[PDB]
Structure formats: structure tokens, C-alpha cells
Amino acid sequence: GPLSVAPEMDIMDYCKKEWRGNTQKATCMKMGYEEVSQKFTSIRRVRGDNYCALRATLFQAMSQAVGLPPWLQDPELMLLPEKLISKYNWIKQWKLGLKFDGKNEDLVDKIKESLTLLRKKWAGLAEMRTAEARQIACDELFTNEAEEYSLYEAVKFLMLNRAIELYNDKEKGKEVPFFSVLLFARDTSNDPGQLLRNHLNQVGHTGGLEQVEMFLLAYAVRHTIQVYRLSKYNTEEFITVYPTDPPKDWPVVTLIAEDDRHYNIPVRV
Ligand SMILES: [Ca+2]
Ligand SMILES: [Cl-]
């Protein structure tokens, strides 16, 4: 299919096209792009569907991949679908986001296939000897075909796993990050099953990640997500980093968000 992350263009040309006229919002948005443009020259427009936040984050993480992170090296990752679904039968209420090949007879098989794909593609990008080869390959992967959407199934599953872990830690009285307190405080998300039924199952289908779920995404893929929040320009939230205090060895991916549903990718040479 066509690219789901558009070819790059100059960021101020993008701004000039998008934000015309004299409203206060238009002026704020221009100031916001001017801020971004101090560090990045170009922008790639990420498809604005209900996967937008996942697409933006994953595209940029994968396009920057020069290694395979430990969490993807871990043999346990491939074992997780069986362990979790066997333990927590309610995970079978999972809403699939593509049609899987018929070799895949159950949910465990489907999720395992998606995690295997994520691992294989990431490993292959990390092995590439030129940055150019890696962007060619990454581009090809985000072409609106089943492979692309299977990556999001993997990432959503990792988000669910991390949320289960954080919930169970809180239940054992262990220290957890505060974002997880806020995640579970939502009246539609009081436990992991509610998170799945009312939030994760909607992601890619009827809505995108909420603010609090960007923390969960960052934790799930162990990337620090640095977001220029252009709707927050004249406040301290003009950038928000998810999470605030990550391990120093998590890679950083930078995004731009005019609002919470739409993330684009700033780029530079
Ligand atoms: Ca190129
Ligand atoms: Cl024009």
C-alpha cells in the first residue's frame, strides 16, 4: 500500500500550509513549529487514524534502531502470550486489529506471530550497515499492509502486559510509577480487564491513546517519548516527556502533537 508515514517536507513550509490567517491558535501553532524548527528541519506526516500515536512512536523508534534492545532479545517475550492468556482468561476478549493467516488457530498464536514479527523486523533494522538501508526498509514496513497493523497488535499487547505488572505490583504493595495510579484511577480503567475492554480494544478502532496511556506506551517499549505539545505552547507542558524520569539508557524518540490524537515526526540529518 501507500506509505502511512509521508515523505519528509520542510517543517516551516508544513506550518505555513496548515496554519493560515490571524487567530490566536494559528499564532500559537506557528510559534510552536518555530520552536521545533530550532532542532529539526523536516517533518513526516503520520497517518491520522486511530493508531496515530503508535505509528508515530514505533516508526521513529524503528527508524533509529541501531541495536536490538534487551527486552526484545529476551526469550521470555515469545512466551508471554501463552502465559498471560492461560492465566487471565479475560484476555480472550481481545479485539483483533487484522485478519490473521489460518495457521493461527487462537489468540495466543496470533499475538505470538505479531511479537515474532516485531522482533524480527527490529533485529533486521538494527543489523543494517547504512542508515539509508534502514530508512528504506522502515519505509517499506509502514505501507498500510497487514505487517504494519500486526506491529500495533504486538505493541498493544506489551502495553497490556506492562499494565498487568504494574497493577499486580500495586496490589502487592510495591512502589509503582504515579502515572499508573492515574491510569487505574479512571473510572473506566480501574483494573487491567477494564483497561483492555474500554481502552486498549478501542485503540486502532474507535479512538487513540489517551495522555496517560502515552506513559504506558513508553514503558511498554522502553523508549523515552519527548513530545512538543503545541496546544500547550505558552506553558511548562510545551514539551512533555513520557516518562519523566526514565532509565538513562532508554532511547529517545521525539514527536510533535498539535493535540492528543495526532502525532507527527520531526526529522533532521
Ligand atoms: Ca531518503
Ligand atoms: Cl502552498
Residue numbers in the entry: 78 to 346
Authors' text:
Having established FAM105B as a Met1-linkage-specific OTU DUB, we named the enzyme OTULIN (OTU DUB with linear linkage specificity). Crystal structures of the OTULIN catalytic domain in complex with diubiquitin reveal Met1-specific Ub-binding sites and a mechanism of substrate-assisted catalysis in which the proximal Ub activates the catalytic triad of the protease.
OTULINcat was crystallized, and its structure was determined to 1.3 Å resolution with SeMet phasing. In the “active” conformation (occupancy ∼30%), the catalytic triad is formed by interactions between Asn341, His339, and Cys129; e.g., as observed in OTUB1 in complex with Ub suicide inhibitor (Wiener et al., 2012). In the “inhibited” conformation (occupancy ∼70%), Asp336 pulls His339 away from its catalytic position, and Cys129 flips to an inactive rotamer. Linkage specificity in DUBs is not well understood, and the structure of apo OTULIN did not explain its Met1 specificity, because of its structural similarity to the Lys48-specific OTUB1. Ub-based suicide inhibitors that comprise an electrophilic group at the Ub C terminus (Borodovsky et al., 2002) covalently modify most OTU domain DUBs but showed no reactivity against FAM105B.
